[PDB]
């Protein structure tokens, strides 16, 4: 019983004499598969994760400056120069200011003035390239128990999309999965920033107005287009001051509202076919049972109109099979718990069944239990 | 000589027999006023500053959370409650999640779940209200020297807009100033944020989507509309996680591009009339001089076509007056330095004069100086 508690639950039943069912697996969605004369199974895509992305480009959303120095020359005497102008860590701008006798110039007019400051980026985001080969889906498949927990999952690659999965007491199910990515991973980038990750169209990402570097650890972290966070402006023709822009983290979140949020984890969807030829529902061997049952827990209806009945048994036969059906005038009702069995008379066992609409009577015999039930619709 | 070096310089000359001139003072603009038989003066609005603003509202651009706690109840059992729901420091949201036997509920369905977290605002901006009464303009007025510096300013309120200013050796000038604010200070707010200030329309400011408080130091700092930085979202119908938005400092700068940047300082403009009736140009008393001059510094042209001549003198008479005019054929050229005088034959003195367009000859006499000059236009 893995999906009965979940609200986002889907039932997939195979038509007559089918050995197989197609299912679609989305995150947060639990699917119970059924086939006649077969166990009922529950399947869910828990997580998809890509191993080992590659940093395509790191943009920087918050920077600061230091070591500000300026060079200035009087009019007629050429442009100003600073050794820091070819130091890649510095951001610089040249301009002109008023000059005359009062500031040491033999000529009145515009003199060149260059201002340089050390560019230190305080916090950054990074866009990584993700590759279809290095995807891995985690798909769990369980049996619709009947029994109580007494005191598996498959990895899916694009290079190994078929998994054989062995189910104790029930056989071996074969799960054949095709990744249905709604993306082109060369044309989208996985953007991470201060714990949180999205994935977005790439061309957008490379068009974002922030300083960038194809950051290789083989060279120190210099920045291209520093001017998108650090600028300069001329204060009334004699000074030049550095303009730092402030952290674009909030601007980035406001831009990523209409995006898809999240080694590294993601949420996609996956189409698969389950082949159950070598699957057999255990308890086929047993005998329809002899004694009375008694409600261990009151009848409980799930969020899908189906109801849960948990009971404990009366009688001598330890291994046996529950007689079970319901009537308005009996019709063989639908059962999700397939072939309800008694594995241990000591222990209590659950049975999930779909009742008919309106009034129904579920019966479970000599002194059998007649539980009234009603379904609205 | 206070404006000759400045490029943003304006000349204001009074028409015939005027005792007065109207001037307009903007920041970064230096104005030289002239009147015939009067000294030439230089006037500039250095700074305007408002004393003592009042914090109208403080918005918060970066927040963080702490002490996260959740309450949850099973279906049919009412909404979830937490004592922190009326603690103003907490931000909270209620929702519903999947519940059943597997998580301790006797009924399958949606159960209420409330999540609360302590709202701590990390950095904030503030909008202050500014009042016309508490403006003060700093206006400096100097005399167009002639002489060299050898080794004033007036405060202007709206309640005292006329200043008497005493100029040694020249008399007393009376400066009558009207503040021409292009604003309505009740309908604009002075916004400051992490060292930098603008002033913007108020209604805009109160419409900005950030948590706010009319922050009084009389009560601890609680925040209204915390949801504009801290939200909650339901992870697949069983968890609820807090969404912090990130510092809106960069978003604020990007929104304030089309704004007007800057006890607290500002930049406006100021209209004034200068009355110079009790002003007299000193040196009227003296005698046109006897000897030869000699260029102490080569003739230098300013950014306004006018040229500067600095000289030292020959002769016996310590206090005297420079003979001065220029010709193509002499026309009495315009002089900004009014009544060039010899205060100390030891010391050198500057004369600023407007020459005619094209070729001119400036002469300054027995062995007088004939300086060729040419003006392009």
């Amino acid at each position, epitope marked *: 019983m893995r999906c009965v508690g979940i609200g986002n639950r889907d039932f997939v039943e195979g038509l007559s004499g089918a050995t197989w069912v197609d299912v679609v697996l989305e995150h947060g969605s639990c699917v119970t598969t059924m086939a006649k004369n077969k166990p009922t199974l529950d399947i869910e895509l828990l997580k998809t994760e890509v191993t080992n992305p590659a940093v395509l480009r790191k943009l920087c959303i918050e920077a600061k400056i230091s070591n500000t*120095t*300026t*060079d*200035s*020359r*009087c009019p007629t*005497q050429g442009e*100003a120069t*600073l050794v820091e102008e070819q130091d890649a860590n510095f951001v610089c701008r040249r301009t002109v200011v008023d000059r005359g*006798w*009062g*500031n*040491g*110039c*033999g000529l009145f007019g515009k003199g060149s003035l260059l201002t340089c400051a050390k560019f230190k980026c305080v916090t950054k985001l990074e866009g990584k390239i993700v590759q279809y080969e290095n995807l891995k889906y985690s798909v769990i498949v369980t049996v619709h128990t009947g029994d109580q927990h007494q005191v598996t999952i498959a990895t899916i690659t694009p290079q190994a999309p078929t998994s054989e999965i062995q189910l104790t007491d029930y056989g071996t199910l074969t799960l054949d999965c095709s990744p249905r990515t709604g993306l082109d991973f060369n044309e989208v980038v996985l953007l991470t920033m201060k714990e949180k990750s999205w994935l977005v169209h790439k061309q957008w990402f490379l068009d974002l107005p922030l300083p960038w570097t194809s950051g290789a650890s083989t060279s120190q972290e210099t920045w291209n287009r520093q001017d998108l966070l650090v600028t300069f402006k001329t204060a009334h023709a*004699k*000074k030049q001051e550095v303009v730092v822009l402030g952290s674009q983290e909030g601007a980035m979140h406001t831009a990523l509202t209409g995006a898809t949020e999240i080694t590294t984890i993601f949420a996609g969807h996956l189409k698969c076919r389950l082949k159950m030829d070598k699957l057999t529902l255990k308890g086929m061997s047993y005998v329809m049972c002899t004694g009375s049952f008694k409600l261990e827990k009151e009848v409980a209806e799930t969020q899908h109109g189906t109801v849960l009945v948990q009971v404990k048994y009366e009688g001598t036969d330890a291994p046996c099979k529950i007689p079970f059906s319901t009537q308005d005038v009996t019709q063989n009702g639908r059962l999700i718990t397939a072939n309800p069995i008694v594995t241990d008379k000591e222990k209590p066992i659950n049975i999930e069944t779909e009742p008919p609409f309106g009034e129904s009577y579920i019966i479970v015999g000599e002194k059998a239990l007649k539980l009234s039930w009603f379904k609205k619709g | 000589m*206070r404006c000759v070096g400045i490029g943003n310089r304006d000349f204001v000359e009074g028409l015939s027999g005027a005792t007065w001139v109207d001037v307009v003072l903007e920041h970064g603009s230096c104005v030289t006023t002239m009147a015939k038989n009067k000294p030439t003066l230089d006037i*500039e609005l*250095l*700074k305007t500053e408002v004393t003592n603003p009042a914090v109208l509202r403080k918005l918060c651009i970066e927040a963080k959370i702490s002490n996260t706690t959740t309450d949850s109840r099973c279906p049919t059992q009412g909404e979830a409650t937490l004592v922190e729901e009326q603690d103003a420091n907490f931000v909270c949201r209620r929702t519903v999640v999947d519940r059943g036997w597997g998580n301790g509920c006797g009924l399958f369905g949606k159960g209420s779940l409330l999540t609360c977290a302590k709202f701590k605002c990390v950095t904030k901006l503030e909008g202050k209200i500014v009042q016309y009464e508490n403006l003060k303009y700093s206006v*400096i007025v100097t005399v167009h020297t002639g002489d*060299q*510096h*050898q*080794v004033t300013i007036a405060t202007i309120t709206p309640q005292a807009p006329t200043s008497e200013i005493q100029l040694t050796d020249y008399g007393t000038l009376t400066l009558d100033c009207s503040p021409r604010t292009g604003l309505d200070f009740n309908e604009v707010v002075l916004l400051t944020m992490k060292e930098k200030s603008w002033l913007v329309h108020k209604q805009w400011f109160l419409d900005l989507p950030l948590p706010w408080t009319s922050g009084a130091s009389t009560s601890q700092e609680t925040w209204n509309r915390q949801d504009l930085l801290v939200t909650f979202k339901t992870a697949h119908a069983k968890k609820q996680e807090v969404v912090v938005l990130g510092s809106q400092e960069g978003a604020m700068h990007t929104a304030l591009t089309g704004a007007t940047e800057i006890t607290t300082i500002f930049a406006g403009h100021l209209k004034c009339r200068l009355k110079m009736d009790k002003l007299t140009l000193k040196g009227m008393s003296y005698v046109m001089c006897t000897g030869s001059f000699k260029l*102490e*510094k080569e003739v230098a042209e300013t950014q306004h076509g006018t040229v500067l001549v600095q000289v030292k003198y020959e002769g016996t008479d310590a206090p005297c007056k420079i003979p001065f005019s220029t010709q193509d054929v002499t026309q009495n050229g315009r002089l900004i330095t009014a009544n060039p005088i010899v205060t100390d034959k*030891e010391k*050198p003195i500057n004369i600023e004069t407007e020459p005619p367009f094209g070729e001119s000859y400036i002469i300054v006499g027995e062995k007088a100086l004939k300086l060729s000059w040419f003006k392009k236009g």
Partner: antibody
Framework: EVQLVESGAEVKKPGASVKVSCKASGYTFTSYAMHWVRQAPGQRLEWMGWINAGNGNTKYSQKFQDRVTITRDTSASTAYMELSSLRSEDTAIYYC?????????????????????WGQGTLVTVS | ALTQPASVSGSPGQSITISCTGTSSDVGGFNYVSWFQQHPGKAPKLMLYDVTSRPSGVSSRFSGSKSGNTASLTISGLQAEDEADYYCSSHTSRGTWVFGGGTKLTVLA
């Protein structure tokens, strides 16, 4: 009259920190920047740096950059100069000298008559 | 970074020039050059500023001039008290100050 007066003669031995005061009188202390310059006995003058007494902005020379700290206390018309991690060649007469700040409160271009008034010097001596 | 002689001598009544050579960046590029007179155990006194300008108190004998990268302060009508060290100072293009090595001017008897 304009006057600059610095602290007493001080001897400290290597590794320590030295602090020398400069108090100005006869002019508005906040309208000038205070420069510090030193000279060893019998050698040249070596410009150390300056501080704007209005807003506390500093400027240091390369040789002293993260060894010097020039500060101001406007309350008592005083500028201080502190040297860290003194070594063999730090013995010097230390001078303060003023230069006026422009009409906007900034110090970008000095005035042609910079260092028009000086202190009288204090020796810091090594051992 | 500013160079000048180490010592310069003359006799009473004569004129004597001391030169001060620098860069396009400090001396040849700006009029921010000035001359100071230091006596033994005394503050340097500003005697020239703006290459030719004299503070009130300094007499006409001192005068400055600039040519290329070299400023020159010279004293006329030499006197015995003029015996002193002389230093040249210049603002630089980078907003800093540099001095010369100083020259000890000696006048004999």
């Amino acid at each position: 009259e304009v006057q600059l007066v610095e602290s007493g003669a001080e001897v400290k031995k290597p590794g320590a920190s030295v602090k020398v005061s400069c108090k100005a009188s006869g002019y508005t202390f906040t309208s000038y920047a205070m420069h510090w310059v030193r000279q060893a006995p019998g050698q040249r003058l070596e410009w150390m740096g300056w501080i704007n007494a209005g807003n506390g902005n500093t400027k240091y020379s390369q040789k002293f950059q993260d060894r010097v700290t020039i500060t101001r206390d406007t309350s008592a018309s005083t500028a201080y100069m502190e040297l860290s991690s003194l070594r063999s060649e730090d013995t010097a007469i230390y001078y303060c000298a003023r230069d006026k700040v422009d009409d906007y409160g900034d110090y970008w271009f000095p005035t042609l008559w910079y260092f028009d008034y000086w202190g009288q010097g204090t020796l810091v001596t090594v051992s | 970074a500013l160079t000048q002689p180490a010592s310069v001598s003359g006799s009473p009544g004569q004129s004597i020039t001391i030169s001060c050579t620098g860069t396009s960046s400090d001396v040849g590029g700006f009029n921010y050059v000035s001359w100071f007179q230091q006596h033994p155990g005394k503050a340097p006194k500003l005697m020239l500023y703006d290459v030719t300008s004299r503070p009130s108190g300094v007499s006409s004998r001192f005068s400055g001039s600039k040519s290329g990268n070299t400023a020159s302060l010279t004293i006329s009508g030499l006197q015995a008290e003029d015996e002193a060290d002389y230093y040249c100072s210049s603002h630089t293009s980078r907003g800093t100050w540099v001095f010369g090595g100083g020259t000890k001017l000696t006048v004999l008897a």
